Design an enzyme around this catalytic site. Structure first.
Site, PDB file in Angstrom:
ATOM      1  CE  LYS A 175      97.502  48.339  65.682  1.00 45.13           C
ATOM      2  NZ  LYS A 175      96.703  48.706  67.086  1.00 45.13           N
ATOM      3  CE  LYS A 212     102.232  51.111  66.858  1.00 40.97           C
ATOM      4  NZ  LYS A 212     103.423  51.335  67.974  1.00 40.97           N
ATOM      5  CG  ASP A 217      96.658  51.581  64.448  1.00 39.26           C
ATOM      6  OD1 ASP A 217      96.095  52.660  64.022  1.00 39.26           O
ATOM      7  OD2 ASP A 217      96.903  51.305  65.490  1.00 39.26           O
ATOM      8  CD  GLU A 239      93.757  49.871  65.674  1.00 40.62           C
ATOM      9  OE1 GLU A 239      94.388  48.942  65.318  1.00 40.62           O
ATOM     10  OE2 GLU A 239      93.537  50.381  66.973  1.00 40.62           O
ATOM     11  CG  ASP A 297      92.467  53.603  69.247  1.00 37.27           C
ATOM     12  OD1 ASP A 297      92.465  54.055  70.308  1.00 37.27           O
ATOM     13  OD2 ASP A 297      93.678  52.915  69.134  1.00 37.27           O
ATOM     14  CE  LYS A 344      94.117  51.781  71.971  1.00 37.40           C
ATOM     15  NZ  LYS A 344      95.094  52.732  71.524  1.00 37.40           N
ATOM     16  CD  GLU A 359      96.008  47.039  70.014  1.00 31.58           C
ATOM     17  OE1 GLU A 359      96.477  46.862  68.987  1.00 31.58           O
ATOM     18  OE2 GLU A 359      95.936  48.214  70.502  1.00 31.58           O
TER      19      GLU A 359
END
Ligand SMILES: [Mn+2]
Ligand SMILES: [Mn+2]
Ligand SMILES: [Mn+2]
Ligand SMILES: [Mn+2]
Lengths: 360, 360, 360, 360
Positions: free
Chosen positions: B155, B157, B186, B212, B237, B261, B315
């Protein structure tokens, strides 16, 4: 003529693959005419609510007793009576309706297709499912079927393996066959919308003609979205579990093609209601099957012959997968199509010997 | 068994990057059993409403006093009482629920996953975030993680640099890795819909598996539109800050994947409500994290094991970023997955020495 | 502990107004613990897809063999395995899940409600169905039930007679009772939207608190329209035949109240998924029943106790309609409610004598 | 001028009906000017995410340190910096912004309303909440407030008792008062849509002018439906927890009136953004309060004076509920309105003695 007796027989026939289990209906009428029907499914309860065991149990205890004594010639009244006392149970209803239509056709000397209004064709295009799992073996089977002119349309059941693997497999087959054949896929609800987004794009960009039931029937909006974005048209199968479902999907614009299955709608007359709905909305048609033997295949076929157009053909190959049958008349597959005769009823008669041999 | 005391401890642990701040909950029960939980976030108030400081303050003054004296074994009644007197405060509620579930599992001798119904797997696939900022360094880190079989999913960012720069970076990584790894991004709400339109197209066309949270949760229609046009599926998310948000996004068709989450939903049981919602709609799942240590990672994990399917993995790498821990049992990362034992509760015990050492 | 044997017994019990047929499940575990469950319906196939006969046939041939040998303590894995091999068959799944939950509760010494998270109440409000057909007789029955403090909420099954006749009947009852009782109706899908338009107006204007399933589940838009125009709130029952249906109806805004039935969803755990969906959308709740005896009533009740709120109460009156039972513990109906004890499992034990007496 | 120090003081003031907890902010600037602000809520965490304790903790640890050293005169830059590092935390942000605006007004010699553009009025209509619980006592209180010309608009908090009871109570009050007063209700999210359907009808038919937040913010469609069917207009309060929420509700048509609260939006400037959104959509306005003392009341008031129109008045009665204050200037309530002077800043100064007396 009155309905005297109804028998539901579970029959286990061997396949070219294992075994396929059929539920053969025999409806005896007071005028001596007998009608035969079939209520078959795939894998017990894996592809539907009804199993062979549940089908027989309900026919013996609920459905049959409601018909004994009624006019065998008033199929509408009979089927409506069943709708009043039984919710769902479409497979069972399908076998029963097929049997009544058969008997009525023998009685009046007309083929079921004519009882349903009149045929506009005498044969239907048949698609073959390549299922070996091995790409090379599939291409070989496909080149063979083309050589003997049995099939020129092919279907691939995918979704049980990693997406990338199934995509490599399908693309290779369409690549090797070129425009000699039409390649379609059936995902059997195996993907979720997130997987289907890319999958549908790759398939459509590589010459796949249609993607059948990519995602689950529970995801309605997903169907509506894929119907709008997929480069290859989306066909509904599992989403149709009733005639009312077809209306719903049509009004929603959830698929551009409907798979017509007598077992999922409730019989040859019911499947026609679904086809009419799709026709009124501009939705393309395809003749589906639950891998029925000759009885159910012919009961489906007779209904499909009355249709103005079946843009995507049919998959009435069920009898070709069985090594033994329970009828005396083998189906005629020649020149990429299934041929339906103009004999009365379903045009089939039971082989009492093999029936007794394979009945459980 | 009654809840006797609840302690909220702010702990500062060093990372391989800086430091990560955890809020460790210790719930003491009258039967001598103690449950441990964790309420962690990233960057104070930058990625959520709750900070470590605000979390502790609310637990000490409001949340804890409402539980002292209640049955430790009736987690539902306890959590519902908190919903009645406290709006939001999901991170804090998450730590508390994790602690109660832990204690209850030690009490009955069952792993939390079993308290939640029963696990269908014993390990979860873990994705690694490449964060060096340097493309070459990232590719190297990725080839290393693949070599030692720790991670095969990665992943990135992005969003803090000019769009074109982040796109060049991501595309190069997916190019060098090929189909050896899965590359996802993300954007952490950094783009506006106008930037995401082209960005999502480039990413999807270059093999990125999922994007994401590309745009902000405030732009609902933007999410719905990107979900329809992005070649690569869109995952939500930040848009999920409650179970009710998940329903809303599902009904809207704002994302084809949901990040689960525990901290954003209110605990392991709450995160399951969200997962159930997504399942009922056909929405794919991914196990998210707020970079929690072992307590929170295991509390999340135990809930994810009960899930039918997690299409996109998880993750749960939080413990791998810390150089020091406050528990005695280190997590088991081998063969691209995190392995969860069948020991009671969360299967963890506090190291009193390190806890006292890192507590502020 | 492993699942050793599962038995499905069809039982015919006499009622106060005929006979009710139950399917009693007995799941034997290797640790000697036995769990009991119930899969009951009304009228064979008239109010659902499953009949007692079909339920038993499928359990014996398909569902049971898939569970023999699995861990009796991992209910989630067991129920998910059933979803994988059997489409639909929620009534059968419901009895099986109830049995597994029962055995697990006896094993751990906890009431099923606690296994499900924890109860927030010990009793549930019960509504009584006035079914004599005679208005005067119904008012008398209602005044009696109020006198002995058994019921203060009443439900009327209408729809089988001319609309005006059913309306006169209902309005007279609400008029005579005044605000001493709550009067609700259940049309059981008998009306079409054209009939319901005026009917719902008259009922709402004459103090009827809620109208349950006025039109058929096939008319989705009709439900959405009535939900917007009916002066009295609309409750969905038959429209929910699965958890996924609940999501669909919620997203559509087709009803402001959901009837929760374990048999229509697949068990106590499944019904909670549906309740969670409704809660996330702000949809009110009502505890429904398929007229189950004590086993099914208690299995339902144990799940309803975990609910935050059931705005419209329940109709768990099934046992009150039977003159004979097959369990040793009679249910406690006092002060307008049903009281659920804190004994292990379902808190019931079979009376082997009566079971043998009424089993067919 | 630079921001030198920011202090967050929790103050407990006694009320006429318990105690109200305020968080007083004092921002000291290098030019010697001091600004005062207030961040107050009702019931700890029951009516919002922020408690007094959480508010202070976050200001001391995160929000304040980000402002020390910045130009006190650039409020925009300061507030945007807070948005960049802190998600949510609107109450805290509100107190801080009020303090900066206060200091800036004293500095330039202008009232906050003028800093905000300019006032179009000097007083605001104030509504009184009748809260005794006793109908007769409420009518008496209302007739008193009318006699002394303090209030002619009245609000009733309902929803905690059975629907029929709250309805009888409200209808009786509107009946006795006639068209001498305006009667409105606030259900504080207590009802579910099924309860609100009939409740809103009865209230609207009995002269209630508006129904504030009848159902929960989680039920969006429910709000849209009630906005279309309720005879009395629907006002949103709890549904607005940010400026972006206002846009969302406006675009959805979920309410015809918006309650403006500085604490729920992030300050006097933020509340104006929300008001502008509503104005651009044709949504009516109402000045709300979180029961703040004079500082917060005046900070709100100063913003409401700049508004073109506030169709439904305001409820800035907070100071009237406190028996003791921490400022030297008491508010002026005369002739059904609150009067705001043209003195610099908020026009208030702290009473150091009482502040020290009531600070905890
Ligand atoms: Mn298919
Ligand atoms: Mn993320
Ligand atoms: Mn009903
Ligand atoms: Mn309000």
């Amino acid at each position: 003529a009155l309905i005297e007796r109804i028998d539901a027989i579970i029959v286990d026939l061997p396949t070219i693959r294992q075994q396929q289990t059929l539920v053969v209906l025999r409806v005896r009428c007071s005028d001596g005419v007998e009608g035969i029907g079939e209520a078959t499914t795939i894998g017990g309860l894996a592809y539907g609510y009804e199993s062979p065991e549940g089908i027989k149990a309900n026919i013996d205890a609920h459905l049959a007793p409601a018909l004994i004594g009624l006019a065998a010639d008033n199929i509408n009244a009979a089927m409506l009576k069943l709708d009043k006392l039984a919710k769902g149970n479409t497979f069972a209803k399908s076998g029963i309706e097929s049997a009544l239509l058969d008997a009525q056709g023998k009685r009046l000397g007309l083929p079921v297709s004519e009882l349903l209004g009149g045929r506009v064709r005498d044969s239907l295009e048949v698609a073959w499912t390549l299922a070996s799992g091995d790409t090379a073996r599939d291409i070989a089977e496909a080149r063979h079927m083309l050589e003997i002119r049995r099939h020129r349309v092919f279907k691939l059941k995918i979704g049980a393996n990693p997406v990338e693997q199934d995509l490599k497999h399908v693309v290779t087959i369409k690549r090797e066959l070129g425009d000699s054949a039409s390649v379609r896929v059936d995902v059997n609800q195996y993907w979720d919308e997130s997987q289907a987004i890319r999958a549908c794009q790759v398939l459509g960009d590589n010459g796949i003609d249609l993607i059948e039931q990519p995602i689950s029937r529970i995801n309605r909006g997903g169907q509506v979205r894929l119907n709008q974005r997929t480069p290859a048209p989306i066909m509904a199968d599992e989403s149709i579990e009733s005639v009312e479902d077809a209306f719903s999907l049509a009004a929603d614009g959830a698929a551009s093609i409907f798979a017509l299955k007598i077992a999922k709608n409730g019989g040859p007359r019911a499947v026609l209601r679904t086809a009419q709905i799709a026709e009124a909305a501009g939705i393309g048609l395809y003749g589906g099957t639950m891998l029925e033997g000759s009885i159910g295949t012919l009961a489906s076929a007779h209904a499909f012959l009355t249709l103005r157009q079946l843009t995507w053909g049919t998959e009435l190959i069920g009898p070709l997968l069985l090594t033994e049958e329970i009828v005396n008349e083998p189906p005629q597959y020649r020149d990429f199509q299934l041929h339906i005769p103009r004999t009365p009823g379903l045009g089939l008669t039971l082989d009492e010997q093999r029936l007794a041999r394979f009945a459980r």
